Design a protein around this ligand. Sequence first.
Ligand code: NAI
Ligand code: NAI
Ligand code: NAI
Ligand code: NAI
Ligand code: P8V
Ligand code: P8V
Ligand code: P8V
Ligand code: P8V
Lengths: 331, 331, 331, 331
Amino acid sequence: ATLKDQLIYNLLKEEQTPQNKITVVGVGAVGMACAISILMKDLADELALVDVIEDKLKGEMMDLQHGSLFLRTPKIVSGKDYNVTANSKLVIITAGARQQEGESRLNLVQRNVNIFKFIIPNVVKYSPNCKLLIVSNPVDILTYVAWKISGFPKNRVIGSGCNLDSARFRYLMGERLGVHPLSCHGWVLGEHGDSSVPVWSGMNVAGVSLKTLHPDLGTDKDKEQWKEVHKQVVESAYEVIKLKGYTSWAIGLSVADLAESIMKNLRRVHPVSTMIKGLYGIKDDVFLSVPCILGQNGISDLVKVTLTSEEEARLKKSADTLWGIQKELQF
Amino acid sequence: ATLKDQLIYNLLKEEQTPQNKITVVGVGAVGMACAISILMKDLADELALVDVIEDKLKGEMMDLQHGSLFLRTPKIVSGKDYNVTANSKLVIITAGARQQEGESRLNLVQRNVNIFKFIIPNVVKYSPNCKLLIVSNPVDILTYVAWKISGFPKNRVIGSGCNLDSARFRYLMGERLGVHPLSCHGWVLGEHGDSSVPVWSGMNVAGVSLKTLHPDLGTDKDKEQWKEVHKQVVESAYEVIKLKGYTSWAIGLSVADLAESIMKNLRRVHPVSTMIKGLYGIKDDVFLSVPCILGQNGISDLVKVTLTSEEEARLKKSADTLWGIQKELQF
Amino acid sequence: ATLKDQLIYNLLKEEQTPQNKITVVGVGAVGMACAISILMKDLADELALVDVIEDKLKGEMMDLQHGSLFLRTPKIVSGKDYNVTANSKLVIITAGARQQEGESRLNLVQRNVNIFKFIIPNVVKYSPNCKLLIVSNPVDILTYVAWKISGFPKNRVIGSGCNLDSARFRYLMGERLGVHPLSCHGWVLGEHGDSSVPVWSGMNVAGVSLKTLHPDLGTDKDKEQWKEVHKQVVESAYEVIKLKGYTSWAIGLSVADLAESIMKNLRRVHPVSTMIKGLYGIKDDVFLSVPCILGQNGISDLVKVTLTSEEEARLKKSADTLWGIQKELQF
Amino acid sequence: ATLKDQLIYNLLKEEQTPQNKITVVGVGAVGMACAISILMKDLADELALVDVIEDKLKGEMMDLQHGSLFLRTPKIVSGKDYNVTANSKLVIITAGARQQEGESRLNLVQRNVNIFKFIIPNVVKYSPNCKLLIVSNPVDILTYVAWKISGFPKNRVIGSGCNLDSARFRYLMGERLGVHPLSCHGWVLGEHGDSSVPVWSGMNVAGVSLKTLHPDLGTDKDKEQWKEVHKQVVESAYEVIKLKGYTSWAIGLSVADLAESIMKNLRRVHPVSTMIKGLYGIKDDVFLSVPCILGQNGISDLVKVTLTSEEEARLKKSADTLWGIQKELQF
Ligand SMILES: NC(=O)C1=CN([C@@H]2O[C@H](COP(=O)(O)OP(=O)(O)OC[C@H]3O[C@@H](n4cnc5c(N)ncnc54)[C@H](O)[C@@H]3O)[C@@H](O)[C@H]2O)C=CC1
Ligand SMILES: NC(=O)C1=CN([C@@H]2O[C@H](COP(=O)(O)OP(=O)(O)OC[C@H]3O[C@@H](n4cnc5c(N)ncnc54)[C@H](O)[C@@H]3O)[C@@H](O)[C@H]2O)C=CC1
Ligand SMILES: NC(=O)C1=CN([C@@H]2O[C@H](COP(=O)(O)OP(=O)(O)OC[C@H]3O[C@@H](n4cnc5c(N)ncnc54)[C@H](O)[C@@H]3O)[C@@H](O)[C@H]2O)C=CC1
Ligand SMILES: NC(=O)C1=CN([C@@H]2O[C@H](COP(=O)(O)OP(=O)(O)OC[C@H]3O[C@@H](n4cnc5c(N)ncnc54)[C@H](O)[C@@H]3O)[C@@H](O)[C@H]2O)C=CC1
Ligand SMILES: Cc1ccc(C#Cc2cccc(-c3nn(-c4nc(C(=O)O)cs4)c(CC4CC4)c3Cc3ccc(S(N)(=O)=O)c(F)c3)c2)s1
Ligand SMILES: Cc1ccc(C#Cc2cccc(-c3nn(-c4nc(C(=O)O)cs4)c(CC4CC4)c3Cc3ccc(S(N)(=O)=O)c(F)c3)c2)s1
Ligand SMILES: Cc1ccc(C#Cc2cccc(-c3nn(-c4nc(C(=O)O)cs4)c(CC4CC4)c3Cc3ccc(S(N)(=O)=O)c(F)c3)c2)s1
Ligand SMILES: Cc1ccc(C#Cc2cccc(-c3nn(-c4nc(C(=O)O)cs4)c(CC4CC4)c3Cc3ccc(S(N)(=O)=O)c(F)c3)c2)s1
């Protein structure tokens, strides 16, 4: 008998079926930050990685496996073939093309769409019941693209959206007030990044409305220039990109936070990008961030935030602009 | 009054002194993997980062700060100046040079020695009571260098050593047996990397000696070639370097595991590199990995492993080789 | 040589000094629930237990010690003598008397005051710099008592207060809305228990004011009777006492949450009982729960909640009542 | 519209099917310690409690629910009817009768059997695919009883067995050596409690066999009396029972450790009680503790520890004695 059989007596020929499986597609800096954050939060019993760069994919997988002693996720797999992703509960898309020198963002949009046309059908083939969490940028457009290609109902297609923008907002608010972001509440909604909308009416500590304490909050008359807090939500992302080349740690932690609510059926509220047609006069198929209740079925509910006329008009303008771009995309 | 003062009444404006502070020096892939792993294990109330590349250093710090909402380490700081490291309990050195084309390894090591001659006095100046955890390679030589330059007692200078090699051993052992590495026990000692020593006599599951079950274990007569487990401990690191360019995740996790024992005073046993003169037959000032008990005072004790004649001769040969190299380095 | 000395080489025999020590005084159901919750959140490197019942104290300590394999708090000690508590960062008082048949509540409180007159000087003797977290009831009165006897500055004497009441409020609010309590925000302030004050103006999800959506919120005109949420905050505690004899698990979890903010210096906001003279219109030395920022210095700051006339009159009435009782107690 | 519907827009009529559900039956001290330890380790997305004492059951449930803010287990339910347990992955039995004054242990055996004849059929009715983890004493007899009544294959019926005995052994070994139990390895096998067997051949630190260092280890000639370490594994349990009335914290943590391996499919090795017929000459249906590999299918494999003739004869004697009692039990 082999040493294994001398040492170990086998009771069961196991069926080996994954119960809490997560897949990450695209193992760049963002995908691997998502991966490590999920691993260190014990959110999955199996982690699958997919990419098209075969050596990079296998190297990252092996690096994680070598740390298995320090983890409680017993199976880490990888491959270019999507059979490694079968029966995932949650599939996180972090794939994208590399912007070339002198290439505009507009050119990236169709290249990432072309990547999604290859990825998303293979995801559905092997995990027809999964939740899809889209991180690749432009995230609101690509969440729509993923929704359309997958055929999924809208509860099962989730865009990272303004989850990270809101985390940045609360960090910066916390720095102004000397309070941990966990206790500084404030919401950034709409489009991820440049066009996001700070909802000044919801900014509060311990339920005390900042806007009621300081009616000029967020306006141009504001002597304390709190609008600069939202300007820095946008500008600080561009700054990290300039300083280190890309962002990764903050989005990875924010993605693991969303995965936690989904895998643990927590029904916490997150600002994520969701199919918003039927609200705010929006009549087109577009994805924008609103506060959503997240659990094991994806987005089961959303909060209807009371918006001023100006705030509603900004969200409607994002919806119109997104539909304008989406109708020109080739599927 | 300002909004903050309208909202918040201050009881004490006190000079915050750090209680559980860790510094990582060098924010390459290895340093940041250490940083993220430490953050997600709640080991510190303050994390300081140091490097010489100023924009990269600030970008990585800010990226971590943007994730504060998802963390419980309230202060993350950085700078090229070592006053940001003051009063650290643990200082992790992952700094190093990159080999230039056609540069000999000996010259690369001397460049790393020169880097340590700059770093180590500045660390001591601002945290004279810290523990030093050396990760930069060649790790056993540079741990000696750190020990010589710092003036620290040997309990407070620890080299990552074979902690990671042993983790790889147990992952590979677990894969052969179908058992989690947490339950697969085995020790790789001596030098990190190619010259490491697999202690076949300690390989066991549930206290069952594999060597006693299988007396050919690890020999050339072994029909199952268990020696290939140790060969892959060495080769897989080179393979990961070839596939993705470097290793980072597994070393980051293993470093956070050592930090956990030190910061929480666990007195767990780890294979780390320590000044071994007078033990294991070594008569020179060199650092080799043996099982060490780690706690709030660093290495308080070490385990005297019973070695065969061959294993003892291999460690003595490593010590002779390390001593020859160290006297060829300029301090 | 002994087996230990054959196996282990000692580098330093040093006098272990505790770095992150917590003491719980009183090992009833409440004290032990605090103990287990603190152990499972890795908040301390040393846990000390104190009581006057010597056999029970030793049995509980040993029970915890038998679980050390599953914990990461390496030292658990106990004793009737307070030298076991030396150098605690945080001291949690859950000690109290049991009401005797036919004994008036005022006499029961005086017996608890007498207990504090024994405990508090001995705590101060061995940990003069600790933070005091008072859980014993009546908690607001006894927090004042602890503050008066200790001589501590007010930032270092904290009463559990309405931390638990607010947790119950948010659980009940979450149940009504189908949202996790982590995302349901609402504050119960003032006295712990029957006289607590629900701040309807701060009740919100995602920054959306329920009171603004529903102006009758909490009034008698409310067709949905949201006032019953606060009524159940009070009644459910009495119900648990009736059904199982006492409450323990929820208070233990809420105490560990406060300990987490203090031990890790998080500067999160909690509703805890603090010396409120000069704020909120109170002119006597009394402790009432307001939102406080908690960190390594205890209460460094507090939030000034905007109150209605009725809410302010209720807090002033609580202060008048507390002051009348305190002058009827013998110190 | 109601306030809920004004605030929240519903996307899905959810099916509400539990994915990682655990049930605890019997909410005495042991059951509630299991419950809190499982809750604080995030092992379940739904926790169900069952007992026959209806008020106590509802009070404990409510106490846990009031701490929901501090947990990430979103549904806690209870009831005397087993429909609350439907679709559990893992069902933990901690039910038992109260020993009356002057009542022998022998009388308790049939009373606990009678309790199991009511419980186990109802568990199977609502969770036919679950794993059963038996904690009630006498644990090896009652694990057999549970196996027989359930009809389950032997991989899905697990007795707590010697898991806690081994944890106590490693704690006491750690205290002798000054090393954390996590790094002190040693196995207690066979029957839980009085008749358990310390396997001296497996006792080691860092793979260094204590028995080889000290051949008198565990014998009567041992000047250091290491056999007293195993005597205290037994005696310390009786001591805690004498000092505080019962044990609870250590078993609760040990049970949560087993639940972790099962729910996370970790395939760690634990000494748990398993149907051992076919090994050691045992030819009867009995449950004894050996090192077992635990995962999502229960006990999938077990380690065949090399035993001395004396050790094998003690295990065989336990098997004979257990079968002698079991054949007299009424089903
Ligand atoms: N939604 C948010 O808040 C933010 C999203 N992001 C976005 O994440 C995405 C990835 O970011 P990085 O990792 O820095 O970029 P990256 O270029 O380093 O990595 C992208 C990976 O996608 C892989 N890829 C390309 N085609 C593929 C295909 N058919 N199938 C599988 N993999 C494929 C690539 O090989 C690459 O390894 C970017 O679009 C980035 O803008 C970045 C941070 C914040
Ligand atoms: N001991 C072990 O088990 C392992 C150790 N390592 C070693 O970790 C070290 C770092 O690895 P990588 O991050 O991949 O290399 P890297 O070259 O990307 O990172 C080195 C960083 O040190 C910085 N640096 C140079 N001089 C400095 C100085 N005086 N002060 C502060 N920073 C300085 C550099 O700017 C760089 O950011 C390497 O030496 C590597 O061999 C890598 C994996 C396993
Ligand atoms: N503030 C809050 O939100 C809540 C606070 N509590 C309060 O916690 C306190 C303890 O609650 P339980 O454990 O259920 O009561 P308990 O009577 O079972 O525990 C009290 C323990 O204090 C010990 N004791 C008496 N005098 C002592 C002295 N000088 N020194 C040390 N120990 C002494 C007693 O031996 C006893 O073990 C009670 O006063 C209770 O009202 C209970 C739940 C919620
Ligand atoms: N295997 C091990 O390592 C150890 C096991 N134990 C055992 O755990 C068991 C429980 O211990 P404790 O909580 O201290 O005892 P306990 O008597 O306080 O609690 C037992 C609970 O079982 C309930 N019960 C009785 N009949 C029931 C029925 N048909 N259905 C549902 N519930 C029923 C009882 O009402 C009671 O609430 C005991 O047998 C104890 O010996 C204790 C610690 C270590
Ligand atoms: C006609 C056209 C319409 C859209 C086009 C386009 C485009 C494109 C292509 C590559 C990258 C991006 C992009 N990445 N990125 C990042 N953010 C982070 C972070 O860490 O936050 C890291 S990189 C951001 C946010 C910015 C840093 C703060 C954008 C901008 C963007 C723009 C538009 C939508 S949207 N609502 O239209 O989908 C978005 F969601 C985001 C954008 S061309
Ligand atoms: C005269 C001279 C002799 C030696 C010289 C030299 C040298 C040098 C310079 C840069 C990097 C290294 C080096 N990095 N590295 C890594 N490992 C990992 C991981 O993921 O494990 C990632 S990179 C390894 C280990 C190998 C991958 C498995 C080495 C080799 C080494 C050699 C010698 C000592 S030692 N015992 O003398 O300290 C070591 F500890 C390690 C080595 S110049
Ligand atoms: C002249 C006098 C006036 C008052 C006297 C008095 C008194 C006394 C003596 C023992 C126990 C208590 C008490 N315990 N207890 C618990 N709560 C929990 C929980 O799980 O929440 C578990 S038991 C509560 C709260 C209630 C269950 C919901 C009280 C009442 C109380 C009363 C007064 C103050 S106060 N503001 O004056 O400090 C308090 F803080 C609390 C009270 S004698
Ligand atoms: C003819 C007969 C045969 C058996 C009978 C019987 C019986 C009985 C009835 C109630 C309680 C027990 C019992 N509980 N208990 C606890 N332990 C702990 C802990 O914290 O460890 C807490 S209480 C222990 C262990 C001891 C404290 C250290 C026993 C003893 C025992 C005896 C027999 C088997 S077995 N192998 O036959 O199943 C066991 F598993 C355990 C036993 S009458």
